[PDB]
Amino acid sequence: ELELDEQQRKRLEAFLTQKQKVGELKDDDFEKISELGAVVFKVSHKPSGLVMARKLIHLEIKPAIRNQIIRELQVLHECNSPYIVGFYGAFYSDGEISICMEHMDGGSLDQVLKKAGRIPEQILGKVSIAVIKGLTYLREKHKIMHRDVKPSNILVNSRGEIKLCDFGVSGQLIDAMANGTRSYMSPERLQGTHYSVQSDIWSMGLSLVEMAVGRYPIGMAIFELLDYIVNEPPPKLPSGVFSLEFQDFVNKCLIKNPAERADLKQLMVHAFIKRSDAEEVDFAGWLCSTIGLN
Amino acid sequence: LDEQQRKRLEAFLTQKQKVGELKDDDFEKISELGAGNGGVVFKVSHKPSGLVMARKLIHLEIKPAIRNQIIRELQVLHECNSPYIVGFYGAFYSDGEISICMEHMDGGSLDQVLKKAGRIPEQILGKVSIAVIKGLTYLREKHKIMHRDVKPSNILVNSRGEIKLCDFGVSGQLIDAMANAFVGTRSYMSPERLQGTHYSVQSDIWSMGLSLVEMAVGRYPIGSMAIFELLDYIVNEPPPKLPSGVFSLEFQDFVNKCLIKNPAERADLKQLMVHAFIKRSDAEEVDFAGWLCSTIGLN
Amino acid sequence: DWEIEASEVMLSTRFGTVYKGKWHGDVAVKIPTPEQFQAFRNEVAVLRKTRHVNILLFMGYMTKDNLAIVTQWCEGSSLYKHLHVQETKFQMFQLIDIARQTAQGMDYLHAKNIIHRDMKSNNIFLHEGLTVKIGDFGLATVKSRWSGSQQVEQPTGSVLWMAPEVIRMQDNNPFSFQSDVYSYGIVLYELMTGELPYSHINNRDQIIFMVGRGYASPDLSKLYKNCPKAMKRLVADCVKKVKEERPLFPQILSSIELLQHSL
Amino acid sequence: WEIEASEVMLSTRITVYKGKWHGDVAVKILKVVDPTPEQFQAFRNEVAVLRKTRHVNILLFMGYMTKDNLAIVTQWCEGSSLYKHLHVQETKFQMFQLIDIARQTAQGMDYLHAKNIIHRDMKSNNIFLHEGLTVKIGDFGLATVKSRWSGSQQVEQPTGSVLWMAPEVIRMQDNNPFSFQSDVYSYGIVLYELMTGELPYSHINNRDQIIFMVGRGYASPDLSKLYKNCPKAMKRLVADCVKKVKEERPLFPQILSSIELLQHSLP
Numbered sequence A: 001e002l003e004l005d006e007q008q009r010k011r012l013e014a015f016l017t018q019k020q021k022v023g024e025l026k027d028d029d030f031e032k033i034s035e036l037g038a039v040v041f042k043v044s045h046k047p048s049g050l051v052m053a054r055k056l057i058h059l060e061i062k063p064a065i066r067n068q069i070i071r072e073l074q075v076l077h078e079c080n081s082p083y084i085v086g087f088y089g090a091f092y093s094d095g096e097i098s099i100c101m102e103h104m105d106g107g108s109l110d111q112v113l114k115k116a117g118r119i120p121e122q123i124l125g126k127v128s129i130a131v132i133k134g135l136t137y138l139r140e141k142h143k144i145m146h147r148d149v150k151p152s153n154i155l156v157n158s159r160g161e162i163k164l165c166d167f168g169v170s171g172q173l174i175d176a177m178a179n180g181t182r183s184y185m186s187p188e189r190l191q192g193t194h195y196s197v198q199s200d201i202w203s204m205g206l207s208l209v210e211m212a213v214g215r216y217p218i219g220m221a222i223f224e225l226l227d228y229i230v231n232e233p234p235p236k237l238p239s240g241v242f243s244l245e246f247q248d249f250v251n252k253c254l255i256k257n258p259a260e261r262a263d264l265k266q267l268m269v270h271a272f273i274k275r276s277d278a279e280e281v282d283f284a285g286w287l288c289s290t291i292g293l294n
Numbered sequence B: 001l002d003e004q005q006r007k008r009l010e011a012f013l014t015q016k017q018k019v020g021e022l023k024d025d026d027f028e029k030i031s032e033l034g035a036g037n038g039g040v041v042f043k044v045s046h047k048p049s050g051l052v053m054a055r056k057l058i059h060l061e062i063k064p065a066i067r068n069q070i071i072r073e074l075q076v077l078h079e080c081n082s083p084y085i086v087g088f089y090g091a092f093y094s095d096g097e098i099s100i101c102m103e104h105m106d107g108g109s110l111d112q113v114l115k116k117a118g119r120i121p122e123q124i125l126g127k128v129s130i131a132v133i134k135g136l137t138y139l140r141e142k143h144k145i146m147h148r149d150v151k152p153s154n155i156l157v158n159s160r161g162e163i164k165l166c167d168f169g170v171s172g173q174l175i176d177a178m179a180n181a182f183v184g185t186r187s188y189m190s191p192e193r194l195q196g197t198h199y200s201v202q203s204d205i206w207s208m209g210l211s212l213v214e215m216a217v218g219r220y221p222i223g224s225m226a227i228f229e230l231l232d233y234i235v236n237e238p239p240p241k242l243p244s245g246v247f248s249l250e251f252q253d254f255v256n257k258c259l260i261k262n263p264a265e266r267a268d269l270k271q272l273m274v275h276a277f278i279k280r281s282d283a284e285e286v287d288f289a290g291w292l293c294s295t296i297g298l299n
Numbered sequence C: 001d002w003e004i005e006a007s008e009v010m011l012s013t014r015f016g017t018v019y020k021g022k023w024h025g026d027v028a029v030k031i032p033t034p035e036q037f038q039a040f041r042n043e044v045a046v047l048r049k050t051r052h053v054n055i056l057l058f059m060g061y062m063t064k065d066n067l068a069i070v071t072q073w074c075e076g077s078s079l080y081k082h083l084h085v086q087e088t089k090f091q092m093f094q095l096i097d098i099a100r101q102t103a104q105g106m107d108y109l110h111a112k113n114i115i116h117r118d119m120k121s122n123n124i125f126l127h128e129g130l131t132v133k134i135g136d137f138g139l140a141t142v143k144s145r146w147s148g149s150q151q152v153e154q155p156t157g158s159v160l161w162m163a164p165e166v167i168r169m170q171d172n173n174p175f176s177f178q179s180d181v182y183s184y185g186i187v188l189y190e191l192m193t194g195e196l197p198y199s200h201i202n203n204r205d206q207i208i209f210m211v212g213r214g215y216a217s218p219d220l221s222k223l224y225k226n227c228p229k230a231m232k233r234l235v236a237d238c239v240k241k242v243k244e245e246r247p248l249f250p251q252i253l254s255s256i257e258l259l260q261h262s263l
Numbered sequence D: 001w002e003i004e005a006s007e008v009m010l011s012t013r014i015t016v017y018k019g020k021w022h023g024d025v026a027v028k029i030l031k032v033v034d035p036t037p038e039q040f041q042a043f044r045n046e047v048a049v050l051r052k053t054r055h056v057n058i059l060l061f062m063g064y065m066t067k068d069n070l071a072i073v074t075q076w077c078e079g080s081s082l083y084k085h086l087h088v089q090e091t092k093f094q095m096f097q098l099i100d101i102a103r104q105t106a107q108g109m110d111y112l113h114a115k116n117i118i119h120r121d122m123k124s125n126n127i128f129l130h131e132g133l134t135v136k137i138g139d140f141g142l143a144t145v146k147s148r149w150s151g152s153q154q155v156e157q158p159t160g161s162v163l164w165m166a167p168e169v170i171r172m173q174d175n176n177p178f179s180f181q182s183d184v185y186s187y188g189i190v191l192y193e194l195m196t197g198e199l200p201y202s203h204i205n206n207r208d209q210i211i212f213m214v215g216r217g218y219a220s221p222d223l224s225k226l227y228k229n230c231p232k233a234m235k236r237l238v239a240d241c242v243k244k245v246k247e248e249r250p251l252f253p254q255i256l257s258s259i260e261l262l263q264h265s266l267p
């Protein structure tokens, strides 16, 4: 599952090579190009010529904590996978933490959903494989879960790649950012139970229902949403539209009990994944056609 | 002094013997006699002695050392005992105000009396002149002190017919402290003191003459002009004079000799005491007490 | 009236971040529908009603270019920065003094029917380490006879200081004097523990759910042993889950003054 | 801004009381039960001036009480007036502190004039050093708001302290001799107090003589008594603010600019 084909291995080696040309990141080395959303800018690193995405985070914390966050963020230099957004570096300037990462010209699947209305099932089958493989990579190779899986944190590009981003690689940053109108949190995490990658699987199933039906599928204020997640049954795909294997896939992702919920190994050999993995789908074509790219 | 004056001066000192350390909590307000630029005066009753006093209060923001020097310099008033000087009981500090307790004159000041009477007859002013000249002489001979602030509000009278001076410059630190004051309305400063040249009791004589004119005609005679214009008139314009034929020629020569702008050419206390106006006034048997009581309302 | 000509105000440094300036000395300035004019009017109208040493001094408003509100520039740091960033060591009498001055300004606000609605240690400035200044009235409002009629929007601030009924948003207008008191109680917790509440919870939605459901509340065992028992009761009373049981600021002032006379 | 009289407690008399209204306050109450129509207009004008001031160097106005006796409520400053520090307690200020007091006072005056407020009674006693740190300009009982017809109306006689009055205000040869420059002069005398530790004309102990000699131009503050520490730019500023000629005196925007420049290069 963490084995790369020839094309993915060459793409990963090429990214590392381009990453070699990048040295110490300074605020002056960057030129703002546009705003991708929020804050995150599409920027240019003048010494290297590389296009990057620069996320800025403002925190009022002790300087020692800020430095440890920068040290914990360095672990992203080891997170190299076809299903993980690449990382260039992270630094501090003007009171804001700058996280500089691979630029994804397709944006987030939250953005793709707005331009598509709803995302087809075969496309979502390729998305499910990517998220599952990305969650597997993080667990097997780095012993961390994601903690914030949702459509805005699944990025895509015109090469057909699908990658996770904004996972909890820095414990100090997780604690600092504990201070959104929707929510993709699992029931067990809302109630203060200990949690695992199982809660990411719930978050993925919830995101799949949203992208499939083109609607956030809960129900309204934030508390009533969280009350609905904990005390009401999970959502489900409509019965007539989507295949039975896709319906069973999300249902096993949305079981409220995390132990009875399916794990990554179960999901990887699920019939919905077997079928979508064998299907030849032109994701890059669909993406560029859906967004209006070249 | 005469027999009546000596008897009264001993009666004052005898009552003063019953007054000791002055404290604020021992005083009881009775009325408000007045309030001027520097401070305010109340009629009080010293409850231990059961006496009636006039408690002037002067507000000053000064160092504690300066206020004690003022209290020490005011103790010289214990030695200023004269029928033409207001008596002294004691001076202390309290609540940011120096309290000068003195003799109560139930007739008030000649400023209040002039307001009720309108004009003060020449025969009364003869008695007032004698009182001022003798008070200025006592202060210069027994204490080497000029008054520095002669005006109708600082000439006090009582129902017994006594006329006395008050509020004279006995404390050099109090004089310097009260120079930081607000702008006033009237002025009785001599021309030489205004211009800053040398001055003596001749300035108190100029102020007396001006005060005589104010009480005789019934109106402040300088000049509605502002305080500065009044000072320029005093310095640069000739002095005021009594009207043509309303008074005797002696009062007019006495006033005109008091108001000569040149202090050296101006009459002194010796010349004034032997002046025709003073000799005639000292011979008259005027009943000053009846005039005051019937004019003010005392009975 | 209180309008400032835009040509006079100078900007220097940077509803956003910082904006230090200079208009008759150091000042602080702020960065489009009829709703946002109501936002400017409500903040300006509240500010115009405040003249109290523990309330940030409103100085004037502007309209030209971008809308602006001009206030005094406080010298120093915020209470948040003093407690959680610089770790300024305050003595217990200084902590009780900060608690008193804050209650003084809040009592002034409520007495004029002001609901701050966004009280937190980030909006309490320690002017020169001496005088508490309550600021950031962007969410403030005056209590009126139609306040319950209007549907408020979600506070979208920090959940740490929000009262449970403000989190639940079950009523049209959950804000009140007692919701300000709860926020003040959390500030007391910061003063008397040195920590933010819910240190063990690193999940915003978990805080929203458990506090809204009553399953979570500040840990009173984290209060200093140096903290008087009356102060400990005051913190507990101010963060009561039941709105009506929370004391009002006249009671807060009486309680602090008594334990201060004691010390 | 009216305050209900039940809400205010009066604790200590210093008429002025240290009171309690949402904390310590100062309450200046006029103890007169038959308010003359002149006392009325004076109360309303002072409230009207205070109503326009929102600045850190102006004593904070908080409200007025009309029931019972007329009164004005302000913040209670902790500390002493500049007069008390300089001439009573003889506080030993460093030169940079003295210059900082000069700067903060010019700051508040520059705010007042920008709102067309003439103080008309600027003196050491009306500057309060709150917490030892911050200047608070107070006592607006003589303050006025400049208008179109203000400069031509005949104002009443001046009744304030002589030491700080501009020569043209003493002379009263104009209908209204007050202006921005007369406040500047008064501020200059405050500078003279800061930079010498003494009041002007200490050799003249005659009230009327000071009036006459300042009015005629014969007397002026003795600049030789300025401290040795006092920077020359500060000495020239004292001399500029005290110039006998009205139009020669600088305005507070220039006063502030000069003091700020000097503070940037001072140790």
Ligand SMILES: CNS(=O)(=O)Nc1nccc(Cc2c(C)c3ccc(Oc4ncccc4F)cc3oc2=O)c1F
Residues within 6 Å of the ligand: A055, A076, A084, A085, A086, A087, A088, A099, A100, A101, A102, A146, A147, A148, A164, A165, A166, A167, A168, A169, A170, A171, A173, A174, A175, A177, A178, C202, C203, C204, C205
């Ligand atoms: C809602 N769930 S939660 O309550 O658990 N909160 C949190 N969830 C998850 C994470 C965090 C903190 C955090 C964040 C936000 C973060 C963002 C970007 C980042 O850069 C890259 N990321 C991936 C690939 C390449 C990169 F360059 C690293 C980050 O690392 C982090 O640790 C949370 F606070």
Ligand SMILES: CNS(=O)(=O)Nc1nccc(Cc2c(C)c3ccc(Oc4ncccc4F)cc3oc2=O)c1F
Residues within 6 Å of the ligand: B038, B056, B077, B085, B086, B087, B088, B089, B100, B101, B102, B103, B147, B148, B149, B165, B166, B167, B168, B169, B170, B171, B172, B174, B175, B176, B178, B179, D205, D206, D207, D208
């Ligand atoms: C306008 N001329 S000026 O400018 O020279 N100013 C001054 N003139 C004159 C004097 C002073 C100061 C002064 C004053 C005011 C004073 C007042 C009352 C006092 O009590 C009694 N007095 C007499 C008899 C009994 C008393 F109980 C003693 C006083 O002793 C004083 O020294 C001045 F400041």
Ligand SMILES: Nc1ncnc2c1ncn2[C@@H]1O[C@H](COP(=O)(O)OP(=O)(O)NP(=O)(O)O)[C@@H](O)[C@H]1O
Residues within 6 Å of the ligand: A036, A037, A038, A039, A040, A053, A085, A101, A102, A103, A104, A105, A107, A108, A110, A111, A152, A153, A155, A165, A166, A180
């Ligand atoms: N590497 C990237 N390449 C392209 N677009 C990006 C990249 N990183 C972020 N973005 C975009 O920037 C937007 C803002 O990101 P972010 O600040 O994480 O908000 P978010 O994803 O919606 N999660 P949240 O902050 O909780 O709302 C995302 O929704 C993406 O569309």
Ligand SMILES: Nc1ncnc2c1ncn2[C@@H]1O[C@H](COP(=O)(O)OP(=O)(O)NP(=O)(O)O)[C@@H](O)[C@H]1O
Residues within 6 Å of the ligand: B033, B034, B035, B036, B037, B038, B039, B040, B041, B054, B056, B086, B102, B103, B104, B105, B106, B108, B109, B111, B112, B153, B154, B156, B166, B167
């Ligand atoms: N010993 C006294 N007995 C009775 N009345 C007195 C006495 N001393 C003063 N007064 C009255 O109190 C008033 C106030 O006096 P004072 O405080 O000296 O101001 P003033 O002399 O009238 N004018 P000014 O010198 O400018 O303050 C006087 O005018 C008298 O009427």
Ligand SMILES: [Mg+2]
Residues within 6 Å of the ligand: A152, A153, A165, A166
């Ligand atoms: Mg994201």
Ligand SMILES: [Mg+2]
Residues within 6 Å of the ligand: B036, B153, B154, B166, B167
């Ligand atoms: Mg007198």
